[PDB]
Structures are given as structure tokens and as C-alpha cells.
Amino acid sequence: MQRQFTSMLQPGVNKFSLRMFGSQKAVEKEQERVKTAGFWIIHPYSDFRFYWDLIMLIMMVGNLVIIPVGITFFTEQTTTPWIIFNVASDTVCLLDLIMNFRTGTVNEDSSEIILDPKVIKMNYLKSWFVVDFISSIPVDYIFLIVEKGRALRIVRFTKILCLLRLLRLSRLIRYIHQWEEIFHMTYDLASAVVRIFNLIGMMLLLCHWDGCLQFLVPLLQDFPPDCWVSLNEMVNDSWGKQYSYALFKAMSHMLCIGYGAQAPVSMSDLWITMLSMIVGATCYAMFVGHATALIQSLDSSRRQYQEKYKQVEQYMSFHKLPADMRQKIHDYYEHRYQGKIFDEENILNELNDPLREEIVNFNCRKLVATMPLFANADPNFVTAMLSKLRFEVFQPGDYIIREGAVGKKMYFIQHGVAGVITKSSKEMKLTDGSYFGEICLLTKGRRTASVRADTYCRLYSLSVDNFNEVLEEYPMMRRAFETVAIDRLDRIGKKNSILLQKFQKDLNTGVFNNQENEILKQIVKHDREMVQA
Amino acid sequence: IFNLIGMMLLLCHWDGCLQFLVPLLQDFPPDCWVSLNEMVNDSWGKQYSYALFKAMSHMLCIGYGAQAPVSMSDLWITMLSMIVGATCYAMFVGHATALIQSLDSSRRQYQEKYKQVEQYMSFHKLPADMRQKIHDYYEHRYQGKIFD
Amino acid sequence: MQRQFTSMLQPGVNKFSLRMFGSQKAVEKEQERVKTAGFWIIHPYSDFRFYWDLIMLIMMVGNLVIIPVGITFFTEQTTTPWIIFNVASDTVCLLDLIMNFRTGTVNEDSSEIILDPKVIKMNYLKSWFVVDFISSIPVDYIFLIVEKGRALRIVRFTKILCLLRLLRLSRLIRYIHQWEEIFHMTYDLASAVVRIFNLIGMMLLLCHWDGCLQFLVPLLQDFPPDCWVSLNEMVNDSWGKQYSYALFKAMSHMLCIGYGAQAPVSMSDLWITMLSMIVGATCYAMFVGHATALIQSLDSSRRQYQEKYKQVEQYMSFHKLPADMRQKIHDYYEHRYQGKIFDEENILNELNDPLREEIVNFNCRKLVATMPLFANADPNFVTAMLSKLRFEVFQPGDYIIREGAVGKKMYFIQHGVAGVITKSSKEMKLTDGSYFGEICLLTKGRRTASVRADTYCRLYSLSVDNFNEVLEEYPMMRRAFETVAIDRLDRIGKKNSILLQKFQKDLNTGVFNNQENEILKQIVKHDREMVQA
Ligand SMILES: Nc1ncnc2c1ncn2[C@@H]1O[C@@H]2COP(=O)(O)O[C@H]2[C@H]1O
Ligand SMILES: Nc1ncnc2c1ncn2[C@@H]1O[C@@H]2COP(=O)(O)O[C@H]2[C@H]1O
């Protein structure tokens, strides 16, 4: 029995323990720390704590609802089921009070308190012991026994002292908050939804309590003729009708609907009504605030994008761009972001190297599969090349490369078809997967031919600095780039002596040409087949 | 919000005093609410309680006292009280909304960050397992806290 | 018939398909994928889906409004038009239920489900089939036929079962949400407006339903004497008056106005009233939240600028600047941003190279047209020079260049007139288009003369690093800059030997002076004419 009880009395390896502690090792360290101190000391995150708190929440929810009804609307409620229920709740509350002295505390400094006699007992005694004690002992039964050891005074005192059990709302709120924060940090719960559900539960409880009180106050006054119960002539009505009307009055005060049958007449009725109105107005204002917060949190993703585009529109209005230019900017913004807010330069920075590598490899899977030069070399080179590419979107008809300008980047086409146009040759179509801009980076010269975006082109651009940095690590890939750059230059206008000298020097050198020649031939054939489309 | 609560209590008290001062200065005309409710000779406690009840009912948008105003002075005093109470309650709702928004800013900012991350993942159309891995890493690295 | 039906049953090339898929090619790929699977399988984005959903929305809007009125306020509503309307709605709902088994699904993982027998049917059956089925079959007519195969019970059961058709609200909400998100991602709709219109429609529908229910409940109870209908003596009134009063009571409960004629008396009336109050209070809180969100989203552009300027004021207060300095800061902020929030360094970064080039060329069109050195050279150089300029604003009387200091940037005047002041010569006015600061960057020395801002000067500054980077690519422009720098230095104080040696070396060299001399002469003449103002 001791082993099974202890195994559940200490924290167990699960989702929440894995997110709390570093790993399994820290979980076992915490288990050993819990097992070391005291005979039985309950960890706040243990399964026994969870089940005991679930039982306590169920009991308090069932008690805070039934006690006021059984006290107010029921006369001479000292029947066997009532004493049985009261005694059961009393003993469960006493057991909870006892177990609270061996449960530890979660300090706000991210620490767990385990030491029993010096900090556990000495902190619960000076924080919540009096509230958890005067709401746990049967004060009404103690007073009845004392007096028994003219009955209107006794009945009134018993009914008044039975309201001390309503202080269990403190324990209910504490347990609800603790386990809701635990579930919040375990699951992906929304803060606004949890808070609005807490407020809805509190509003229902307060409305029920106000409904009970608006009849308890006339009941304690022996139903004066000025009270609403006597005016409506429902003194002898059934408990269901009385409770329904009292709850109706309380909820009408809460939701700002008005009064019951008429305006209050007696002073006690006036003050009870005004207190109920204050409580209900405060609760409804809090509910409106929570609803506003929830509605604002629901559409944050779209609202942020709308704010970004409104800032863009403000910039365009400041610079006084024409209508067609503004339409082009809108089209590009709506084709590039597609109505979504994010920033890759920071999202990818928040991730680690393996996750970023996996995401980039998944993004360019078709580019790797289609590229003749990719998928046929060292995959470390492949991931190094892919980790430096930048996503770009070019609208149809946009000159993405202009001849005569200096070369600073090349592009790998992922989506769409581009067109290479030269002043001395017909345009050649480049489909998906193909790439351009190699010769400008290789020869460090000007662009040879222009490139047009025939359709909406989604391209991956590689800067010259990153290209040289990744290519100085891998020269076989540089020779593979040259073996097709020379071919393309000879196809357009030759004048490729800068790369031709290096290629001839490599051919004359004793390099591993047995596989290099085959790789170059395959790459050239695939590139010319792709460009022949 | 505490300043506004104090101001609301003070204004409700002043309105309660005024709704009886105005009939008092008019020597309790028969059309006034005091004469209609027959509380002219009542004790000061009952009169103050009923006047404060009327003022607070106007403030919190609950309705009127015994009945709708009849005299013109009663009508205009009631309408001024309704205007003041409605303005005060709108300000109170605004302050409550601001307080509730400021209470959960730390969690809301993290939720916004993770929703932006999810939007990025949806834009790039990552598979389910990759999205689960990203979620696990984000929840094991930041532990639900926003900072940089 | 098959060709025309299929051409509209698959997605068509339009605005929304262009924003969904990459381009026309992906649209045709999706069309082929849809045409491949199944005999007839409806794509969610097809025109047939849109028109069928429009018909369904019209029918459900016309049905959820008329069914409660025809059930509650009309006695013995089994006339030919009613059966015709019910049968038409029934068959349209059954056709919609049948077509929902061949419509696919838009997965949250940005995917389209097309496979008919394994995932389309097996997902709609376990998600919404029971709700879409018990709200589609005529349960009331089936029960009537079964019973026909003491009439108060039959009438009550028929009226109760006729409320199962109100579950079409689920289909209405689903279709509205789907097509509103489609229009949101198609057009530039505002999220707050769409959400508040959805909530307004829901509030109207719920108010209408509550108005119908507050009379249906007394009707089912055969108008007890405690009901509000009997108390108001409107049992025999016309249907218009009864509906008007019931809707008035429901809307008064919804908008927190109060009750009808008086407070409820019967228990059923009390509970119906309390449920209506709860629903109306929740709806009004949601409406207040939506209104707050809409109002906050309406003035975001101005609010962000106000927040920025309040942060600036907080910084000034922290540093305890004098009143005149704070006024100067305010004047500069209000003359530079003009009350608009944006950040060019990020807005231009979110754009591509062609769009940025077009925007910059439009911004400096007058500068290009007016500059003698611009508009007469390679336009690649022109755009390279323009892409590196930075916008600056100088208030009148501000010393923008101080003599003796090191040179780090030059300025191109776009708006306003500046004044070159020297300790040994009178001030010379520089109008729009003219530029200064060349000699400090060219000779790498100190400034020769000071420059003052006579009016509000809007200038474009070019850093020394960017200037040298763009000028090492184009030397003819460097010689053109020198040919006027030497002239200006000789005009002020000569001592231009650093550039004079290079100019003499170029003149002695065999450079293409035939056009260079003419260009230099024209540039010098235009510059001196501009400076002679
Ligand atoms: N005949 C061709 N087939 C395919 N691509 C080409 C051809 N000619 C040139 N290109 C590419 O088009 C690019 C245009 O600019 P670059 O001169 O920088 O580099 C060029 C090559 O990458
Ligand atoms: N006579 C002049 N006419 C027009 N501009 C001048 C004249 N003298 C000097 N400048 C410009 O004024 C600038 C002041 O600072 P810098 O010496 O850097 O470079 C100077 C020239 O660009």
C-alpha cells in the first residue's frame, strides 16, 4: 500500500512535468527530493493532488449551490439527508484542511517548498488557515449544542451561522486558479476564453447567491408587510415558485433590466436592492470588458495584417504615388504575403539549426528534385546552399534582370516561367526548377541578357557574397557551374574567355575527370533540355 | 478605475441629495415624487435611502423610482441624472475593459507571437508532423513566456 | 450538357483562384486533379458551388424567418401554400444534403480533399450529417402520417417537431463563414465590419426567434390565465398585433430596456423571460465588444502616430529639453512625417527590386529631369545612384554643412532653396535640382564652405561609401563630377590641385574626349546658370 500510495503522491513523468522540469532526469531529481523530506509530503503537481482537488471542486460546487437554497427556502431543514450531507461536506473539508498542511507551495520565484515544519506549516497558518478553518467547522451545530446544553432567535442564529460555509468560495477560487494555470501551461488554452468562463461561473454563482439573499432577508425579518414577498402574496407559495421569483429579481438587477413586481418600499428591501444593483452592474461591466478582450484576441492575425497594409497605404499617400502604381503595390503585397502577417527573418532566427534546415529543405524539395545540379552531390552542400536563399515574388512583365548592369545575385525559379531576352537572339523560356544569373557572379562582369517575368514568378535569390562563401568550400560545384556557364555564353555570344581559361587549366590538370566529365555532360544536357521548352 | 469609482460614488451621492433638494426648494409641490410617495414627513434616513436609490437606479440604468416623473422639474432633474449616470457607466465600462486588457498582456503577447508563427507555417504549408515539432520546440524553448 | 456542366463544376481562372494557386498553371493542375477523381465531384471554389450556396442562403434566410411565424401565430396552417413552401424547402435541403457528399473539403493544412469514397463521405458522415439530416427530413409530416395510419396533442407535437427545421441555422452559419472568408481573401474587406455584420444578423435572428417563442410557449399551454397574452387580453387579436407585441417584449429583453406590460407571473413566463434576458445580455455584450473593436480599428493609423509622438515627448521630458527645443522638434516631426506613420527602411525592404526602382524613379523624377548630370547618361547608373539616396528635411536657418568638418555625404536638393556661405565670398543661392558636397567626397578633405537652409529644405543625401561604390563602376561620371568640382573650387578659392592633377592626366591620356568635353561644358554651363540664380 505504501509503495502504490507514494508512487502517486510524488510528481509523475507526464506532459506538465516535462514542460516544468528540464527533462526526465530533473523529474526524477524532484521525485527524490519529495521522497527525502517528511514522512508523507504531497507535491502540488502529483496525481493525488489533482484527484483530491477534483473531488474538492465537485464538492464545493455542489455545496455552494445547495446550502443557500436549503437554508433560505426550506423551513426546519434538520432532516436526516441534510445532516448527512452537512457531515459529509464537513469531514471532507476537514480532510482537505489537514492535507493542506502537507502539500507544499509553488513560490512565485519558480521554486517548490517541501520543508514541512518550518515553511509549509508556518506559511499556511498565516495566509489562509483562519478562512479555511471557520468555513470547515460546523459552527451552527456547535452553537446549537451549546445552547441546548423563543426558538425564533435560535433559528435566526443557525441560519446566519450556516452562511459561514459560503467561505469555501476562497478554496474553490484558489483551486480553480491553480489548476487552470496548470492546464494553461500544459495545453494550448486561450487566456481570454478561460477568463471569460471564470467570470461566467462567478456571475452565475453571485446571481444565485443574490436570489437566495433577496428571500433570506425577508425571512429573517419574519416577513414584514412591507417586504416584496408579502406584497406579492407568495409567503405560502411553494419553494420552486419563490426561488424562481427571487432568482428573477436578482438576475434582473444583475443584467440591468429593472426591478421585480414594483420598486422597493421597505428600507431593508431598498438597501438589499441597491447592493444587488451595484454587484450586478460591476459584474456586467467586467463581462463586457472580458467580451471585448476576447473579440479583440479572436481576430488579431487579420488585424495585424490590416494595420501593416494601412501603414503601407499611408506611406504611399505620403509619397503621392499614382493610382496604377498603388494598384501594382497592392497586387504585389496581396500576392507575396497572401493576407498573412509574419517575418521570416525573425521566425527562422527563433528556431535552431536542425529545424531551420528541415523547414528550408521542405520548402525547396521540388527545387532539389528538379535541379540537375542538386540531388547529385554532397547534401551538406545542398543544405548550405538552401539555407542562404531568399524568397522573392516578381509580377508579370517586370524586368528582373537588366543587361549591362552589375551582377549581385542569381535566381532559382521555384514557380512560374521566365524569359531570357537578348538584343541579338530570340527569347528562351525557363520553366520551374531552372536558374539564371550564374555568369554575372562567376565572371564578376555585367549582365549579358535581360530576364522578363512572363507570369507571377516565385523565385529564390542567392547573394553574390553568400554564393562565393558557400562555393569556396566546394569547388567541384564551381566547375559544374562553369561547365554550363561557358555553354550558355557560347550559345548567346561566346566571349567566355575568363571562364574558358580556368576550364582549360582544370582539364589540363590531373583532376578526377572520370566522374566530373560525366556529371558535367549530364548537367549540360538537362539544362539544355529544360531551356529548350 | 479607483479614481473613477470614487467619482461615481460621489456623483451618485450628490444626485441623491439633489433629487430631494429640488422638491425641497419648491416647497414640495403635489406633482413631486416626494408628495406622490407620501414621504414628506418620513424620517431623514428613509428619505435619503429612497433618494439615493433613485439616483443609483438612474446611474446604473435600472429605471426610475416609484413611477415616471410627472412635473417638469422632476423630468429635467431625472434626465440630467440619466445623462450623468450613463456617461459615468460608459467610462466605468471603458476603464474595466482597459484593466482587463492590461491584466493578461503577458499571455496575450505570447499568444499573438505563436499565432504569427502558425500563420507563417500555414503560408509555407508545412506538414502536420513538422508543425507539431515546431510547436513542441516553441513550447520547450520559451515555455509560454514573451521576451527577447 | 456534360461539357458545360463540368466547365462550371471545376474551379475557374479568376481573382480568387489566382490568389489561391500559384498561377494559371496551378489552376489548370487543380482542374485536372478535380476532373480525374470521381464521376462528378464538386470543387469548393467552383462557380456551381457559389451559385448553389447562394440559392441555399436565400432559401434558409427566407425559411428561418417564416417557419416560426407560420408555426406560432397561425392556427391550422396546413393550407396549400404552406405545404408547397415546406415541400420546396424540403427538396432543396435534400438536394443540398446529397450534393454535400460530392463537394470535397478545405483542410486547415492548406489542402483540398477530392477522394470521394474514403475521406469525403467518411468525414461528412461523422461531422455534420446528423444535423443536416434531422433538419432536412419532414419529421412533422412523417409523425402526422404515422399517427393517422384529442387533436390538441397532435397539434402540439406537430408544432414542436416543426422546430427541427430551425437547425438549418448550422448550414446557414457554415456557408456564410466559408463564403465570407473567401470574399475576405478575394476582396479587401475589413474584418471588424464583416464580424459586426454577422453579429447584427445573428442578433436580429435571435430577437425574432425569442419573439416567436414568447408566444409559442403560452400557445402550447393553451393560454393559461397567468400568461401575458391572457393578462393583456390579446388572445383574439390579429396576428400582426400579437407578433408586434411579442417582438417588442423580446427586443426589450435583448437591449436591456425592461419587460412588457408587467413583470412575469407564471413560472413558465418567468423562466422564458429569464432565458431571453440571458441571451439578450450576452448578445448586447458581444455587440459592445464588436463595436469597440471596430472603433479601435477605424483610427489605427492616427493612433499609432499619436503613440509615436507621445514616446518622443516622453524622451524629451526625460532629457528635460527647453521649450524652444521641444517646439523645434515638434515642428520638424510635423514637417517630416506630416502626421503619417510608416518606416521606409522596412516598407522598401518588403518590396522587390523592380517595384523599389519604380517608386524611387517616380520620387526623383523632377530631380532626374532637372539635373544636368542626370538624364544624359546610362540609366542603369541613374537608378543605381537613386536607389542609395536618403530623404532628409532641414528646417530654415539650420547649418546643414559646417566648414572645416570632415566630409561624409553630399546632398541633392529636391525642394527648397539653400545658400552657400563662405568667409571670403558672398552667399550663392542653390535652387531645386542643384546639389552640393561633391568636393569633400572627391578630395577626401574638409568642407570648404558652409551651407544654410533658407527655407524648409527637402534634400536627398548620398553617403560617401555608397557614392564611391556606385562611382567606381562608372568613371565617366566621376570625371563629370570633377569637371565641375574644379570649377567651383576655382570660383571660391582654387587650391584644387588634387583633382587638377587627375583631370590633367585624363586630358593628356587618349580618352574619348570628343563627347566628354561637350558633356563637361554643358554640365558646367548648366551648373553655373543654376548657381547664378
Ligand atoms: N540560352 C540560354 N538558355 C537558358 N538560360 C540562359 C541562356 N542564355 C542566358 N541564360 C541565363 O539568363 C541569364 C541572364 O542574365 P545573366 O547574363 O546574369 O546570366 C544568364 C544565364 O543564367
Ligand atoms: N560658387 C558655388 N556655386 C554653387 N555651389 C557651390 C559654390 N561653391 C561651393 N559650392 C557647393 O557648396 C558646397 C559646400 O560644401 P563642400 O565644400 O562640401 O562642397 C561645396 C559645393 O558643392
Side-chain angles (χ1 to χ4, degrees), chain A residues 1-2 4-79 81-187 189-430 432-439 441-493 503 510 528 533, chain B, chain C residues 1-2 4-79 81-187 189-430 432-439 441-493 503 510 528 533:
Chain A
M1 173 214 69
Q2 287 185 340
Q4 294 277 6
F5 195 48
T6 314
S7 62
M8 94 183 317
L9 182 140
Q10 46 195 9
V13 196
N14 56 355
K15 175 33 161 153
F16 173 63
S17 296
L18 279 197
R19 264 201 51 170
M20 270 316 78
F21 313 109
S23 200
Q24 184 138 8
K25 301 301 290 187
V27 172
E28 316 275 340
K29 175 66 65 176
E30 183 74 281
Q31 291 197 50
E32 210 69 21
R33 195 168 77 99
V34 161
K35 213 158 68 74
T36 303
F39 308 106
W40 310 258
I41 284 186
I42 302 175
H43 199 66
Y45 311 139
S46 59
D47 292 348
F48 180 81
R49 206 56 204 146
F50 177 67
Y51 292 139
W52 186 250
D53 279 350
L54 197 59
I55 290 292
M56 211 65 38
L57 289 179
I58 286 325
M59 182 220 77
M60 276 147 190
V61 164
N63 191 289
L64 297 190
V65 166
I66 296 173
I67 279 285
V69 177
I71 280 311
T72 63
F73 301 109
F74 287 89
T75 51
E76 195 248 349
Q77 191 73 358
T78 305
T79 59
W82 191 252
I83 302 120
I84 283 294
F85 173 68
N86 263 348
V87 152
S89 63
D90 200 88
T91 195
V92 171
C93 281
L94 278 181
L95 288 179
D96 189 47
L97 180 67
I98 279 169
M99 291 190 194
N100 263 355
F101 287 163
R102 313 195 67 75
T103 205
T105 326
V106 185
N107 190 1
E108 290 197 308
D109 312 318
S110 298
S111 185
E112 300 295 326
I113 282 166
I114 303 292
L115 184 51
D116 178 330
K118 309 300 296 184
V119 49
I120 280 169
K121 293 191 181 186
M122 263 315 336
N123 193 37
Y124 176 77
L125 252 66
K126 69 167 60 178
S127 60
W128 287 114
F129 176 65
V130 84
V131 182
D132 291 2
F133 184 65
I134 86 181
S135 79
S136 193
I137 51 162
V139 198
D140 54 68
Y141 290 128
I142 270 48
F143 162 101
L144 196 46
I145 289 298
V146 157
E147 281 272 26
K148 225 172 151 183
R150 61 184 179 279
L152 175 60
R153 175 177 156 277
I154 292 301
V155 169
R156 287 170 67 152
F157 258 122
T158 296
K159 285 192 185 300
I160 272 295
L161 291 177
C162 273
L163 302 185
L164 288 181
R165 294 188 172 102
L166 301 187
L167 286 168
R168 289 162 188 180
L169 175 57
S170 65
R171 305 230 283 279
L172 164 72
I173 285 177
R174 279 153 43 196
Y175 297 166
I176 284 290
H177 280 181
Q178 288 173 6
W179 290 108
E180 272 184 354
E181 89 177 11
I182 277 173
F183 285 179
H184 229 295
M185 149 89 91
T186 286
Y187 306 108
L189 293 172
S191 180
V193 175
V194 167
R195 291 171 70 82
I196 203 172
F197 273 8
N198 283 11
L199 182 53
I200 281 168
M202 197 72 195
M203 271 175 29
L204 291 173
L205 193 63
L206 285 189
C207 183
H208 178 64
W209 278 2
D210 284 354
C212 296
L213 175 72
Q214 299 236 8
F215 193 87
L216 178 58
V217 173
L219 171 75
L220 289 176
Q221 295 183 110
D222 209 16
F223 295 121
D226 284 288
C227 82
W228 66 273
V229 194
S230 298
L231 288 182
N232 299 2
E233 306 191 325
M234 52 184 37
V235 179
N236 288 317
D237 270 0
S238 61
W239 87 266
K241 166 66 178 181
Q242 291 180 322
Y243 173 59
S244 301
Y245 210 99
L247 182 63
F248 165 69
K249 276 174 55 75
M251 180 171 359
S252 60
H253 293 152
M254 167 144 311
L255 304 169
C256 284
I257 303 298
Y259 317 117
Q262 65 269 319
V265 179
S266 183
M267 222 198 298
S268 75
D269 269 350
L270 276 163
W271 283 102
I272 291 298
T273 298
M274 286 160 34
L275 162 67
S276 189
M277 297 193 321
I278 284 171
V279 168
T282 298
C283 286
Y284 195 68
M286 296 286 140
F287 184 74
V288 169
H290 276 83
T292 299
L294 165 67
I295 296 299
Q296 287 185 6
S297 93
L298 275 180
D299 61 346
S300 62
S301 35
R302 194 84 73 172
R303 172 171 45 81
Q304 289 177 342
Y305 172 70
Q306 297 288 348
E307 284 175 13
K308 178 176 70 71
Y309 186 68
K310 280 167 75 171
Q311 286 186 2
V312 175
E313 282 196 302
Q314 282 216 299
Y315 160 75
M316 286 187 327
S317 180
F318 171 67
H319 271 79
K320 300 181 182 71
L321 300 183
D324 47 346
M325 232 165 253
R326 293 188 206 214
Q327 190 48 48
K328 197 173 194 292
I329 296 302
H330 177 66
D331 180 27
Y332 161 75
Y333 253 73
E334 89 174 2
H335 264 67
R336 165 67 165 90
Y337 286 68
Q338 299 184 347
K340 306 186 190 304
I341 197 43
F342 55 84
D343 45 320
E344 305 171 55
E345 310 281 354
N346 182 31
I347 301 302
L348 297 183
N349 269 1
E350 291 182 338
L351 307 173
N352 50 69
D353 301 345
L355 274 181
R356 186 155 55 248
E357 273 182 24
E358 285 178 33
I359 282 177
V360 169
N361 272 277
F362 176 81
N363 286 338
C364 316
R365 55 155 185 297
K366 58 190 81 44
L367 199 146
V368 167
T370 315
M371 261 314 317
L373 172 142
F374 285 33
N376 311 313
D378 162 48
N380 296 343
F381 159 77
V382 176
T383 187
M385 181 145 268
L386 288 179
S387 58
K388 302 166 194 294
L389 303 182
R390 284 201 60 261
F391 182 62
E392 299 206 56
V393 165
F394 295 98
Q395 294 156 306
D398 278 337
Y399 253 60
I400 78 196
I401 291 184
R402 261 165 278 246
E403 65 217 57
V406 75
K408 291 188 183 291
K409 50 170 54 166
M410 87 171 96
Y411 304 88
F412 306 85
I413 307 172
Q414 153 182 337
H415 194 90
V417 156
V420 174
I421 167 166
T422 326
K423 52 209 269 203
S424 58
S425 296
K426 61 163 292 300
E427 46 270 47
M428 304 140 270
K429 260 66 174 184
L430 297 182
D432 321 330
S434 197
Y435 70 103
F436 50 89
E438 42 204 333
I439 47 190
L441 267 62
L442 258 62
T443 69
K444 310 181 189 291
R446 312 309 198 71
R447 303 287 200 187
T448 68
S450 299
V451 195
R452 291 176 58 256
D454 279 328
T455 89
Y456 278 95
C457 292
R458 306 188 181 276
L459 265 48
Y460 270 53
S461 100
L462 183 65
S463 181
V464 52
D465 305 283
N466 300 117
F467 166 75
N468 276 289
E469 151 166 39
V470 65
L471 260 279
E472 68 86 19
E473 296 172 357
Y474 307 87
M476 340 306 287
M477 291 315 78
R478 181 175 280 271
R479 316 319 307 248
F481 272 116
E482 287 163 353
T483 206
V484 69
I486 304 206
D487 174 85
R488 285 171 168 195
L489 276 163
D490 279 350
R491 179 150 52 250
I492 282 197
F503 190 71
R528 79 202 307 110
Chain B
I1 203 172
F2 273 8
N3 283 11
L4 182 53
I5 281 168
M7 197 72 195
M8 271 175 29
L9 291 173
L10 193 63
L11 285 189
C12 183
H13 178 64
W14 278 2
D15 284 354
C17 296
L18 175 72
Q19 299 236 8
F20 193 87
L21 178 58
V22 173
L24 171 75
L25 289 176
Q26 295 183 110
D27 209 16
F28 295 121
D31 284 288
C32 82
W33 66 273
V34 194
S35 298
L36 288 182
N37 299 2
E38 306 191 325
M39 52 184 37
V40 179
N41 288 317
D42 270 0
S43 61
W44 87 266
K46 166 66 178 181
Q47 291 180 322
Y48 173 59
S49 301
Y50 210 99
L52 182 63
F53 165 69
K54 276 174 55 75
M56 180 171 359
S57 60
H58 293 152
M59 167 144 311
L60 304 169
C61 284
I62 303 298
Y64 317 117
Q67 65 269 319
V70 179
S71 183
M72 222 198 298
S73 75
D74 269 350
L75 276 163
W76 283 102
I77 291 298
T78 298
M79 286 160 34
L80 162 67
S81 189
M82 297 193 321
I83 284 171
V84 168
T87 298
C88 286
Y89 195 68
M91 296 286 140
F92 184 74
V93 169
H95 276 83
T97 299
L99 165 67
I100 296 299
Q101 287 185 6
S102 93
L103 275 180
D104 61 346
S105 62
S106 35
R107 194 84 73 172
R108 172 171 45 81
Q109 289 177 342
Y110 172 70
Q111 297 288 348
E112 284 175 13
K113 178 176 70 71
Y114 186 68
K115 280 167 75 171
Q116 286 186 2
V117 175
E118 282 196 302
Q119 282 216 299
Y120 160 75
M121 286 187 327
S122 180
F123 171 67
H124 271 79
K125 300 181 182 71
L126 300 183
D129 47 346
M130 232 165 253
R131 293 188 206 214
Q132 190 48 48
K133 197 173 194 292
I134 296 302
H135 177 66
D136 180 27
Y137 161 75
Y138 253 73
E139 89 174 2
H140 264 67
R141 165 67 165 90
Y142 286 68
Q143 299 184 347
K145 306 186 190 304
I146 197 43
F147 55 84
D148 45 320
Chain C
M1 173 214 69
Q2 287 185 340
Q4 294 277 6
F5 195 48
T6 314
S7 62
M8 94 183 317
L9 182 140
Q10 46 195 9
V13 196
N14 56 355
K15 175 33 161 153
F16 173 63
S17 296
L18 279 197
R19 264 201 51 170
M20 270 316 78
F21 313 109
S23 200
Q24 184 138 8
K25 301 301 290 187
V27 172
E28 316 275 340
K29 175 66 65 176
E30 183 74 281
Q31 291 197 50
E32 210 69 21
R33 195 168 77 99
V34 161
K35 213 158 68 74
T36 303
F39 308 106
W40 310 258
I41 284 186
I42 302 175
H43 199 66
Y45 311 139
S46 59
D47 292 348
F48 180 81
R49 206 56 204 146
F50 177 67
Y51 292 139
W52 186 250
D53 279 350
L54 197 59
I55 290 292
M56 211 65 38
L57 289 179
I58 286 325
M59 182 220 77
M60 276 147 190
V61 164
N63 191 289
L64 297 190
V65 166
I66 296 173
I67 279 285
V69 177
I71 280 311
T72 63
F73 301 109
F74 287 89
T75 51
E76 195 248 349
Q77 191 73 358
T78 305
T79 59
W82 191 252
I83 302 120
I84 283 294
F85 173 68
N86 263 348
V87 152
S89 63
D90 200 88
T91 195
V92 171
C93 281
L94 278 181
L95 288 179
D96 189 47
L97 180 67
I98 279 169
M99 291 190 194
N100 263 355
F101 287 163
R102 313 195 67 75
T103 205
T105 326
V106 185
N107 190 1
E108 290 197 308
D109 312 318
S110 298
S111 185
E112 300 295 326
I113 282 166
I114 303 292
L115 184 51
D116 178 330
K118 309 300 296 184
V119 49
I120 280 169
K121 293 191 181 186
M122 263 315 336
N123 193 37
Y124 176 77
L125 252 66
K126 69 167 60 178
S127 60
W128 287 114
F129 176 65
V130 84
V131 182
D132 291 2
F133 184 65
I134 86 181
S135 79
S136 193
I137 51 162
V139 198
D140 54 68
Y141 290 128
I142 270 48
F143 162 101
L144 196 46
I145 289 298
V146 157
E147 281 272 26
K148 225 172 151 183
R150 61 184 179 279
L152 175 60
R153 175 177 156 277
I154 292 301
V155 169
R156 287 170 67 152
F157 258 122
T158 296
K159 285 192 185 300
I160 272 295
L161 291 177
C162 273
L163 302 185
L164 288 181
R165 294 188 172 102
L166 301 187
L167 286 168
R168 289 162 188 180
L169 175 57
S170 65
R171 305 230 283 279
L172 164 72
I173 285 177
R174 279 153 43 196
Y175 297 166
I176 284 290
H177 280 181
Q178 288 173 6
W179 290 108
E180 272 184 354
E181 89 177 11
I182 277 173
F183 285 179
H184 229 295
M185 149 89 91
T186 286
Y187 306 108
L189 293 172
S191 180
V193 175
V194 167
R195 291 171 70 82
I196 203 172
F197 273 8
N198 283 11
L199 182 53
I200 281 168
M202 197 72 195
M203 271 175 29
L204 291 173
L205 193 63
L206 285 189
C207 183
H208 178 64
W209 278 2
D210 284 354
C212 296
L213 175 72
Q214 299 236 8
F215 193 87
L216 178 58
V217 173
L219 171 75
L220 289 176
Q221 295 183 110
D222 209 16
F223 295 121
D226 284 288
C227 82
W228 66 273
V229 194
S230 298
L231 288 182
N232 299 2
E233 306 191 325
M234 52 184 37
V235 179
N236 288 317
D237 270 0
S238 61
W239 87 266
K241 166 66 178 181
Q242 291 180 322
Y243 173 59
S244 301
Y245 210 99
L247 182 63
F248 165 69
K249 276 174 55 75
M251 180 171 359
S252 60
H253 293 152
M254 167 144 311
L255 304 169
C256 284
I257 303 298
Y259 317 117
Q262 65 269 319
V265 179
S266 183
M267 222 198 298
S268 75
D269 269 350
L270 276 163
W271 283 102
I272 291 298
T273 298
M274 286 160 34
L275 162 67
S276 189
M277 297 193 321
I278 284 171
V279 168
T282 298
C283 286
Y284 195 68
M286 296 286 140
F287 184 74
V288 169
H290 276 83
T292 299
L294 165 67
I295 296 299
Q296 287 185 6
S297 93
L298 275 180
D299 61 346
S300 62
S301 35
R302 194 84 73 172
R303 172 171 45 81
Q304 289 177 342
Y305 172 70
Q306 297 288 348
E307 284 175 13
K308 178 176 70 71
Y309 186 68
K310 280 167 75 171
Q311 286 186 2
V312 175
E313 282 196 302
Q314 282 216 299
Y315 160 75
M316 286 187 327
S317 180
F318 171 67
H319 271 79
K320 300 181 182 71
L321 300 183
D324 47 346
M325 232 165 253
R326 293 188 206 214
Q327 190 48 48
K328 197 173 194 292
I329 296 302
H330 177 66
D331 180 27
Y332 161 75
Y333 253 73
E334 89 174 2
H335 264 67
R336 165 67 165 90
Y337 286 68
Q338 299 184 347
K340 306 186 190 304
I341 197 43
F342 55 84
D343 45 320
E344 305 171 55
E345 310 281 354
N346 182 31
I347 301 302
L348 297 183
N349 269 1
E350 291 182 338
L351 307 173
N352 50 69
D353 301 345
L355 274 181
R356 186 155 55 248
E357 273 182 24
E358 285 178 33
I359 282 177
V360 169
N361 272 277
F362 176 81
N363 286 338
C364 316
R365 55 155 185 297
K366 58 190 81 44
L367 199 146
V368 167
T370 315
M371 261 314 317
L373 172 142
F374 285 33
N376 311 313
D378 162 48
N380 296 343
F381 159 77
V382 176
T383 187
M385 181 145 268
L386 288 179
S387 58
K388 302 166 194 294
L389 303 182
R390 284 201 60 261
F391 182 62
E392 299 206 56
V393 165
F394 295 98
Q395 294 156 306
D398 278 337
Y399 253 60
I400 78 196
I401 291 184
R402 261 165 278 246
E403 65 217 57
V406 75
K408 291 188 183 291
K409 50 170 54 166
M410 87 171 96
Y411 304 88
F412 306 85
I413 307 172
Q414 153 182 337
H415 194 90
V417 156
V420 174
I421 167 166
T422 326
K423 52 209 269 203
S424 58
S425 296
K426 61 163 292 300
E427 46 270 47
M428 304 140 270
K429 260 66 174 184
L430 297 182
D432 321 330
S434 197
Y435 70 103
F436 50 89
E438 42 204 333
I439 47 190
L441 267 62
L442 258 62
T443 69
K444 310 181 189 291
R446 312 309 198 71
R447 303 287 200 187
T448 68
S450 299
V451 195
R452 291 176 58 256
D454 279 328
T455 89
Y456 278 95
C457 292
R458 306 188 181 276
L459 265 48
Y460 270 53
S461 100
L462 183 65
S463 181
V464 52
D465 305 283
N466 300 117
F467 166 75
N468 276 289
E469 151 166 39
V470 65
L471 260 279
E472 68 86 19
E473 296 172 357
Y474 307 87
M476 340 306 287
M477 291 315 78
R478 181 175 280 271
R479 316 319 307 248
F481 272 116
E482 287 163 353
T483 206
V484 69
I486 304 206
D487 174 85
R488 285 171 168 195
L489 276 163
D490 279 350
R491 179 150 52 250
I492 282 197
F503 190 71
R528 79 202 307 110

